[PDB]
């Protein structure tokens, strides 16, 4: 049962919260039987340098075998000072330093959320922290550990759990190394698993007929027309929200309002203004 360490950089904890909303039949087993969530600052029992040292002892015992979940971007300006994640016997550990320490020794890294995947809101125009995507940061620092991106702001819990399931099945079938190689084959050019991000929202939208007819809603509460004029970014967005919907299937963004393209590498600036085409 491999350990998982969940490190957050410049995130909003939305990736943890979205996972707490999972109704995936496998999630309890993932946490109780398949892996061991040894470090997670939002929910773990211990604290402080003790929690950091616990993670370090586990990481040493499972060198090459543990998994990192990284949420949030990694800020490089000011020598990493815009994100400190812990302190060990007076020595501060920035997100930069944490990834330089643990990154080389992980079996793989899951970059969860658009911030970790692509930079996201912390990297957007007007920011000043040098917010950097996980894969870019690791590459820039010569760390070749495999990274899978599971974006969204936040991701749907099914994308996170589903990617874990994909990986589990691949690793059972071909071993750690070979398994990861099979996972690579089903990633798109932005490092996203194609089962969840391989279809365009707009091509699969229930309002596509209205789009084609040129019937556009002029107020959000008109649910008959297409939402394009209200700012819907479905045409430029690769995600399966149209099918699984959100929060136990009770709604989704296009039904409720508009898609804002939250899974895309240019989010938010390339998807803004949100409420104009």
């Amino acid at each position: 049962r491999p350990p998982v360490f969940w490190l957050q950089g410049q995130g909003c904890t939305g990736c943890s919260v979205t996972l707490l909303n999972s109704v995936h039949p496998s999630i309890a087993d993932v946490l109780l039987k398949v892996i061991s969530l040894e470090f997670h600052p939002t929910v773990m029992a211990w604290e402080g340098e003790h929690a950091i040292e616990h993670m370090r002892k586990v990481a040493e015992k499972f060198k090459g075998k543990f998994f990192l979940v990284i949420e949030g971007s990694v800020p490089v300006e000011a020598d990493g000072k815009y994100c400190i994640i812990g302190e060990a016997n007076h020595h501060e550990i920035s997100m930069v330093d944490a990834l330089k320490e643990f990154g080389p020794n992980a079996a793989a890294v899951l970059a969860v959320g658009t911030c970790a995947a692509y930079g996201g809101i912390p990297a957007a125009e007007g920011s000043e922290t040098g917010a950097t995507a996980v894969s870019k940061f690791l590459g820039d620092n010569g760390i070749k550990t495999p990274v899978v991106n599971i974006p969204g702001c936040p991701p749907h819990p099914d994308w996170i759990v589903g990617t874990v399931v994909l990986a589990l099945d691949a690793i059972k079938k071909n071993g750690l190394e070979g398994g990861l190689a099979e996972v690579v084959k089903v990633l798109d050019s932005d490092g996203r698993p194609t089962p969840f991000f391989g279809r365009n929202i707009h091509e699969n939208c229930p309002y596509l007929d209205k789009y084609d007819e040129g019937v556009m809603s002029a107020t959000f509460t008109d649910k008959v027309g297409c939402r394009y004029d209200l700012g819907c970014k479905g045409p430029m967005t690769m995600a399966d929200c149209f099918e699984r919907k959100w929060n136990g299937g009770v709604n989704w963004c296009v039904q409720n309002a508009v898609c804002i393209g939250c899974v895309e590498p240019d989010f938010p600036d390339g998807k803004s203004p949100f409420y104009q085409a």
């Binding site: 909003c12 470090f39 000011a78 400190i84 920011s127 959000f220 959100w246 009770v250 963004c253 409720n256």
Partner: protein, 481 residues
């Protein structure tokens, strides 16, 4: 004689926090809180279409995004001159109210309960301090574990409630300038009410009773954590369309006195914060956010907000104290049976016990019950099919301020619009009021002060430092933004 203890990360909170305390003769005698992660939303927002704010700001915090959504759309409503339709006002209350339920349940069970309840021998419930001061009987400890598990379901259902009219959660799509984007249907109102009944039953039968019952085994924890005994509420959940009656009415309480809230008395100091010295002491309408991560003497990315010079706290205790509602039936009964206390209204707990480590947990449970009544009312008030939004034009020049109460306390957003774009956007949030560093005059932040006197009889197992902090339910994403 003095021992300094540093805790980084403080866990079972949201976000990045370091606490440093000095312990002497078994008690905390000094404290410093450091918010260690910064993003800079107030500068990221500049130059954008102001309507984008009501999406961007939610990413300050995935635990309380509906609060930021609310504050933002209220600011935008003012700046745009938008009159939210009655049914949209109520819809917004239903979207946001449901996350109060989610957030308080998450906080007590998934963040706080391990402070008092021993988890099983599996990660992430072990390892932990060898002497964790976990006092509950076999039976009551098991009830805590069982309810933590059940609460995973309940908090998830609360987010389903949020998403019914909000689109999804975290990060609702359904609140915009001018109201709410989806008119409630009869069928979806039935769905919301079915879930709400499950949540109500859990709150009434499990959550409220367990907080009092666990509290009755930790009566010592009502005797510490008082801090300044000063509180702020800025109002929340409008109950009419004329901006006066609210579920929580505004007010300030300090030195035993109640006074009105005047937002012009807010100033944010930065001497001990990693921001440029010249930006100290600004009211939010003139706020500036210029990071200075190397500035000597500073120790946090949280600014230091003060109300007419006072360091105040916010959250359920603040609101319940300021508004002084009647206590829940189950609370009244357990106060009698377990504590020997006859109490009718919240202030009957007395100031000392209310403003305490355990008092804050009690206030949050009581407030969860209080919110059930409000949501029940809104489910009767809402009208299926009635329009919930107007579609205002973007003004070229305007300003607006949105005031509300996030689950952790007072929140305001201020926007200034120039050339149809955001010229300034300033946020003064709940955990900013609680978890801030010293101001320029050396006055501690609310939680820093509440740490003073906290018992640490065992420096190898200093569990009460973070227990105190967790009582305030911090989220440092909010505090720093």
């Amino acid at each position: 004689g003095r021992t300094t203890i540093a805790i980084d990360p403080v866990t079972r909170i949201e976000g990045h926090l370091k606490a440093e305390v000095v312990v002497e003769n078994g008690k905390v005698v000094d404290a410093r809180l450091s918010g260690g992660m910064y993003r800079g939303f107030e500068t990221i927002l500049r130059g954008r279409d102001p309507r984008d704010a009501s999406q961007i700001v939610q990413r300050i915090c995935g635990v309380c995004p509906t609060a930021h959504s609310t504050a933002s759309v209220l600011a935008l409503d003012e700046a745009f001159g938008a009159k939210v339709p009655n049914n949209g006002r109520i819809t917004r209350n239903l979207i946001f109210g449901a996350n109060y339920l989610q957030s308080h349940i998450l906080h007590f069970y998934h963040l706080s309960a391990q402070d008092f309840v021993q988890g099983p021998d599996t990660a992430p419930f072990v390892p932990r301090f060898p002497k964790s001061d976990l006092r509950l009987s076999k039976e009551l400890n098991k009830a805590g574990v069982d309810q933590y598990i059940e609460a995973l379901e309940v908090r998830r259902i609360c987010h389903e409630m949020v998403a019914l009219f909000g689109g999804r959660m975290p990060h609702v799509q359904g609140q915009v300038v001018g109201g709410a984007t989806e008119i409630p249907t009869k069928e979806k109102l039935v769905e919301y009410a079915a879930r709400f009944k499950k949540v109500r039953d859990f709150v009434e039968q499990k959550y409220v009773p367990v907080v009092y019952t666990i509290g009755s085994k930790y009566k010592d924890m009502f005797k510490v954590g008082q801090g300044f005994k000063a509180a702020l509420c800025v109002g929340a959940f409008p109950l009419d369309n004329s901006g006066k009656k609210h579920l929580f009415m505004p007010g300030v309480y300090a030195k035993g006195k109640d006074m009105p809230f005047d937002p012009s008395k807010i100033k944010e100091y930065v001497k001990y914060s990693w921001f440029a010295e010249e930006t100290t002491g600004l009211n939010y309408k003139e706020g500036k956010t210029i990071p200075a991560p190397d500035k000597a003497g500073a120790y946090s990315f949280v600014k230091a907000p003060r109300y007419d010079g006072l360091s105040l706290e916010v959250g359920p205790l603040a609101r319940m104290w300021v508004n002084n509602p009647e206590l829940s039936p189950v609370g009244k009964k357990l106060l009698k049976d377990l504590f020997g206390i006859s109490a009718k209204k919240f202030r009957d707990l007395g100031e000392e016990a209310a403003f305490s480590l355990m008092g804050r947990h009690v206030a949050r449970a009581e407030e969860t019950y209080y919110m059930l009544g409000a949501i029940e009312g809104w489910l009767k008030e809402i009208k299926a099919g009635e329009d919930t939004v107007v579609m205002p034009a973007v003004p070229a020049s305007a300003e607006g301020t949105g005031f509300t109460e996030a689950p952790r306390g007072s929140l305001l957003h201020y926007v200034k619009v120039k050339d149809s774009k955001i010229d300034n956007y300033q946020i003064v949030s709940a955990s900013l009021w609680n978890c801030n560093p010293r101001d320029d005059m050396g006055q501690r932040g609310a939680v820093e002060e509440a740490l003073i006197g906290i018992p640490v009889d065992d420096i190898q197992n200093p569990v009460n430092v973070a227990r105190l902090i967790r009582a305030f339910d911090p989220x440092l994403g909010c505090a720093v933004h």
